[PDB]
Design a protein around this ligand. Structure first.
Ligand SMILES: CCCCCCCC/C=C/CCCCCCCC(=O)OC[C@H](O)CO
Ligand SMILES: CCCCCCCC/C=C\CCCCCCCC(=O)OC[C@H](O)CO
Ligand SMILES: CCCCCCCC/C=C\CCCCCCCC(=O)OC[C@H](O)CO
Ligand SMILES: CCCCCCCC/C=C\CCCCCCCC(=O)OC[C@H](O)CO
Ligand SMILES: CCCCCCCC/C=C\CCCCCCCC(=O)OC[C@H](O)CO
Ligand SMILES: CCCCCCCC/C=C\CCCCCCCC(=O)OC[C@H](O)CO
Lengths: 210, 5
């Protein structure tokens, strides 16, 4: 473990808690893409199947269980408990254009042709584009609430910290995974317009307009 | 092994 990955994991947990607590306390999921929450829960489900085959650490196990529970709970609050405030009419991204090709790519381009590795690869490719329905919803509706932008900031910063972590691991440990890296740069570049707008507008008391 | 999240 290095500080870049630790801050990255804590930034990811921060985003997940900000969203869950925002929906819970306000009793509303207005402005939130239910489709992106489905994709993030599907990322954790396919990535962490190794909970049954590998033990890295108590931290690694606990973080995995917390991410699965918080992702599934967010989906439960949007689609079941506070479904009266779910804006289905503005969450119109067709997720089939993400799942079917990323599924195809994970089967063809992977480190090993075995079910656990193919499923892990699917989680990596899917995560790179999982936020697309949420950004697409914000551009359609025109605005994003401040708490929603804080959620997007900490979520976007998490995989950016992972890129720094991979430079660190490559230099100090000689470890390199091109699939995680390439997907991680794709994941971060999809936040470029949001980052620019968050720093120049949101951090200056202005409207985030995608 | 995959030791990250
Ligand atoms: C924009 C950069 C983003 C962050 C980049 C993260 C990596 C930072 C690397 C620093 C190199 C200098 C640090 C000292 C490591 C070299 C130590 C050395 O010379 O060790 C010799 C040998 O390995 C033992 O005998
Ligand atoms: C070895 C590397 C191979 C790299 C090459 C493969 C990479 C595929 C990745 C993503 C596909 C994303 C698909 C995005 C589809 C968007 C659909 C869209 O914009 O519009 C549909 C609309 O309904 C029309 O009317
Ligand atoms: C909306 C985004 C538009 C831009 C999307 C850009 C496409 C990059 C996407 C995914 C990474 C593709 C796979 C990365 C390459 C891994 C290839 C490799 O070295 O795989 C090792 C293995 O040995 C092979 O069998
Ligand atoms: C080995 C691979 C090394 C890769 C080295 C890093 C490459 C980063 C490249 C460009 C940064 C600028 C990206 C500009 C595109 C931004 C698009 C954007 O932010 O928003 C559009 C929106 O997502 C539509 O839905
Ligand atoms: C061997 C590989 C080494 C690769 C090491 C790469 C290190 C790059 C670090 C951070 C990117 C920050 C880029 C600058 C963007 C600042 C944040 C932003 O969005 O700034 C917009 C602002 O309005 C501007 O005026
Ligand atoms: C140990 C050396 C390496 C350290 C590597 C990690 C360092 C960077 C970590 C986190 C960035 C924190 C940025 C904090 C931005 C918070 C903005 C915010 O929440 O602003 C709320 C405000 O009210 C607006 O509405």
């Amino acid at each position: 473990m290095n500080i870049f990955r630790l801050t990255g994991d804590l930034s990811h947990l921060a985003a997940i808690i900000i969203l869950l607590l925002k929906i819970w306390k306000s009793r509303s999921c207005a402005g939130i893409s239910g489709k992106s929450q489905l994709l993030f829960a599907l990322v954790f489900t396919t990535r962490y199947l190794d909970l049954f085959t590998s033990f890295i650490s108590l931290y690694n196990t606990s973080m995995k269980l917390i991410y699965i529970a918080c992702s599934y709970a967010t989906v439960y609050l949007i689609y079941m408990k506070f479904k009266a405030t779910y804006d289905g009419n503005h969450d119109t991204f067709r997720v089939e254009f993400l799942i079917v090709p990323v599924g195809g790519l994970s089967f063809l381009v992977n480190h090993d042709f075995s079910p656990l590795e193919i499923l892990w690869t699917f989680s990596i490719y899917l995560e790179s584009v999982a936020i697309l329905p949420q950004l697409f919803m914000i551009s359609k509706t025109g605005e994003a609430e401040t708490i929603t932008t804080h959620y997007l900031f900490f979520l976007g910063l998490y995989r950016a910290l992972y890129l720094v972590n991979w430079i660190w691991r490559y230099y100090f440990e000689g470890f390199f995974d091109l699939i995680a890296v390439v997907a991680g740069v794709v994941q971060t570049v999809l936040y470029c317009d949001f980052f620019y707008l968050y720093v120049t507008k949101v951090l200056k008391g202005k409207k985030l307009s995608l | 092994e995959h030791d990250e999240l």
